[PDB]
Assembly symmetry: D2
Homo-oligomer: 331 residues x 4
Amino acid sequence: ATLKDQLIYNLLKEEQTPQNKITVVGVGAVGMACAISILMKDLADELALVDVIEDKLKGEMMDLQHGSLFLRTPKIVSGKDYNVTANSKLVIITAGARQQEGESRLNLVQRNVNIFKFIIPNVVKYSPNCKLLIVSNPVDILTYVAWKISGFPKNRVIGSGCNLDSARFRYLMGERLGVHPLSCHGWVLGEHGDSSVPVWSGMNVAGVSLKTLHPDLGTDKDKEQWKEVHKQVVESAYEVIKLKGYTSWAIGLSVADLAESIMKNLRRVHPVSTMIKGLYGIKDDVFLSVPCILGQNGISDLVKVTLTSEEEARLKKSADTLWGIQKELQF
Amino acid sequence: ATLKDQLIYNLLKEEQTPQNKITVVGVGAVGMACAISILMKDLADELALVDVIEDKLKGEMMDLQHGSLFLRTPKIVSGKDYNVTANSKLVIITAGARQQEGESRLNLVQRNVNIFKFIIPNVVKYSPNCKLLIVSNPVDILTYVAWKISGFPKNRVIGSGCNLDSARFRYLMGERLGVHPLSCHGWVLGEHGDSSVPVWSGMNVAGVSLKTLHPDLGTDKDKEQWKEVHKQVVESAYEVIKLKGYTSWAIGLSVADLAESIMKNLRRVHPVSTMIKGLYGIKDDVFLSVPCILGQNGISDLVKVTLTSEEEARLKKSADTLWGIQKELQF
Amino acid sequence: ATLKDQLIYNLLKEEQTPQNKITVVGVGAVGMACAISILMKDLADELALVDVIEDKLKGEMMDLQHGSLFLRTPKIVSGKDYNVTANSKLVIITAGARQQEGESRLNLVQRNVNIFKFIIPNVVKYSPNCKLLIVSNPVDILTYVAWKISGFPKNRVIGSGCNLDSARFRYLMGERLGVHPLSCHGWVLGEHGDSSVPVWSGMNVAGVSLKTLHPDLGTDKDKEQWKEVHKQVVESAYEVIKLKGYTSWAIGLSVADLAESIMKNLRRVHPVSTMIKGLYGIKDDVFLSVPCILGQNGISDLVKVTLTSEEEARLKKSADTLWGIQKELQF
Amino acid sequence: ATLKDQLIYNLLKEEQTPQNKITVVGVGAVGMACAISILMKDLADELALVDVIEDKLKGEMMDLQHGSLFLRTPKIVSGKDYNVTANSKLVIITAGARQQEGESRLNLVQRNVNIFKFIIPNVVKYSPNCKLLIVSNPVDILTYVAWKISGFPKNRVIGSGCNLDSARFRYLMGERLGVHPLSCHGWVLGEHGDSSVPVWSGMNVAGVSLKTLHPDLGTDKDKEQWKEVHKQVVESAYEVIKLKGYTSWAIGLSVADLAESIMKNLRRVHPVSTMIKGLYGIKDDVFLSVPCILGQNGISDLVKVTLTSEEEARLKKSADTLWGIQKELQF
């Protein structure tokens, strides 16, 4: 007899059906960052990667697999057939025409418009119940594309929106005050880009409202000039791409914090793109970031933040700008 | 006044003094993979990145800093100036030429010895009390070189060694036997290269020796062809490098593992690379990976792994090829 | 016009069903030590407690509940009626009339079968696809009982067995040798306690047999008295209980280790009790502890440990006494 | 010819100074819950236990030690001699004369001051540079006591205080809103106990002030009756004591978290007790809770919460009664 069977008495069969599968679509720098972080937070027991390049795909898979000793994720699978997606509770989409030196969240749409039409319909054919987390830019419109195509009630199609923008914000806030970002609370909402809006009313430490102590905080009259930390956040990715062509780690850490909420029913509040049709005016079927309540069904709840009239404005604007495009969708 | 002064009341002044600082030298794929693993296991309170590529170094530091929120390591620094290395408990060196497709690791010795002639002085100058962990290849030869240039006790100069080769061995073992690599045991000693030695003696699950249950284990007269699983771990690097152009994920977890045993002082046993003079009939200063005991002081104890005669010859000459290069080494 | 509706706008009318529920039956010391171990390892998104003394049951629930901020398990629930153990993937039994400051585990089986005939059917009534971790003492006969009552296939009625016994054996080894228990390997088997086999072979570090080194190990012939560590691994329950009046922390860490292997599908090996009918001279319907591949379907494979002369005796001697007791059981 | 010397060659002998040691004083329910939460977060390389009951100690130490296989804390030491507290970085005081189903957390201050006159001097002797955490109740007064008997500066004497008063307040805030305690923000400050202060303006989700939406909030005419959340918090302890006899689980999780911010230099914001003389109109040496900033030197910074002289009264009246008792302690 073979050595395996000389050493190991069998007892069953099936053992394949993964119970917490997670799938990354795209294995550029972002997808791998997502992957390496989903893998070290012990979120998924199966991890499936999909992309079109088949050398880069096999090799990345091989490399993580070689570390399984140092992990608690016991199956890692790759391939350009979406059949390995099969039964993923959550699917992360990062793939498509991404970025330049200089180009910003407004030089693709039509590129990525079309790529998506293969990816999405196949994520639904082997993961028909799954949850859809859109990362690749222009992320608010691509959540539109992802939603209609797959069908899916709006709660199960989440875009990653301003989740990282509020993080980079809470980092610059903490660096200014000497407090850990965990203890600085600040929200950045809207469409992820230059038309994000930092809601300064909610900026606080230990409960105390910074806007209250510093009434001119945010207005271009500000002594301390905080409106610029919101400009560091808009141009962080520009000044990190300028130093090394791309961003990766931070999105991966932010994304894995989102998957954490979903995969564990934390019902924490994150700012992510979902369908605000109704809220803040907005009568169109548009997507953009708002304090959501993420769980094993994704966006079950929204936190109806009270905006000022100029804030509610800049939202509707961007919320037009967008639908001025999506009425024109080839899909 | 200032906002930060309406809000926070200072009470203690002074201090940076790093209590558990780690320093990674080199921010290539390997480096940033260690830095990312080491950041996610909460091994450092300060983490420093040093390299010669200014903009890439800066940009990688920023990418990580933008993730502080999802981390628990409160300070991350970088620069060209080893001054930011100062007072480190552990210094992880990864800089230097890495293997092209097909290239051996010993073919990088001369190019890297030059780079160590620069790097080690500056490291010692700022953290003479540290432990040195060598990742760059050829890792056994560069561990030795780092010993001569540092003049650190042999126990504080550790080689990355065959910790990853044994870990790749245990992945392949486990996949043959449908077992998690944690529960498969078996050690790869020697050099981190083509003359590594697999030790079937100690191959076992649940304490059950595999060479007695199958007395043709390893050897060519092997119909199950187990000697090819050690051939797969030798050809591991080449094939990843073939596929994606470099390895990074597995070794960064392999390194953070070593780091875990040193920072927390576990006295775990790893096959790091150390000085073996006067053992297995070797009498010159050749560093080789034997199972060691790592902790707060680095290596402190060598497990004497009882080898065959072939296992002991394999090792001696994997050692004697190693000394060949090492003797003619000029610095 | 509530304030919650003024802040939250819902989308998800309905839903729940927990995807990683764990129930613990009995909130004595052991159970609550299980519960806290399970909780800080974030293995479950819903922890359910059930006992019959309800007051102590609700107080422990609140004590955990209040620590919600520090756990990643959003739903902790308990009660008297098992309708809240519903949808457990894993259920852990600590019930029964507990031993007292020094009672052996073979004077008790009578009353226990009859509580189990209330509990075990209620567990399946609400969580039909769950796995039965039996912790109650004595583990081997009581696992047989749980199995015989639920009608579950043997792969789903796991006994704590000699797991913590091997854990303690490994802690005693490493403290002898001066090594972390992780780098010391050893395997105690059989009926849990006294009739426990210390398989002196498996005793290895870095794979090199402690026996074939000093071949009077685990013998009366031993200068270094090593047959005694086994004796301490049997008299440990005693010496703790004799001092603090029950054992808790070590057992809950052990249960959380198996739980993790089951809930995270790790397929690691552990010395646990399941049916061993057909091996070593057992074709009774006994339960003993052997190395077992634990996965999402409980035991999946047995590790056919090659046992010696004297030891294969001790395994079945016990096994037929057990069968004595178990052939009479009135249920 | 020892089994050890044959299996291991030794390079270093000496050693010791553990880098992140933690001493817990008092192995009651609270102490042991502290010790177990600190062990399952890997904050310490060494944990010491000190107490008075010689046997009950060795049992708790030996139970944990048998769990060494499931922890990354290589050393656990117990003893009634505080020479085992040697070189701690954090020292957690849980010991004292506590209460029943009556005794108010304010009147016994003197019996405890007596006990602290034994502990504190021995603690500060063998760890002159430790951080001192007081959990024992009346935690605010006994913190002031520990401060005097040590001569330590303000920043290294810290009282447990309202840390769990706020954990519980936020957990209940999650009850009403269906949000994880992590995304519910609010502070309970003042004197630990019945006269703590719920800062209602603070209270927010996602940054939106619940006090601005629901202007009654925490008032008497408030139809949702948000006043009884505070009442629930203030009485929670005693209600849990009724049911199970004592509290434990939530404190240890409370203390683990504090211990992490200090041991990892987070600079996170916590409501711990510190010297408040000079703010809100207090001119006596009294400690009560405000949001301090916890680091590697303990308390480095205070948050000056905008109270409103009703709130600010409560604090004053708390200081005055506090200094009342503090003035009549013989020590």
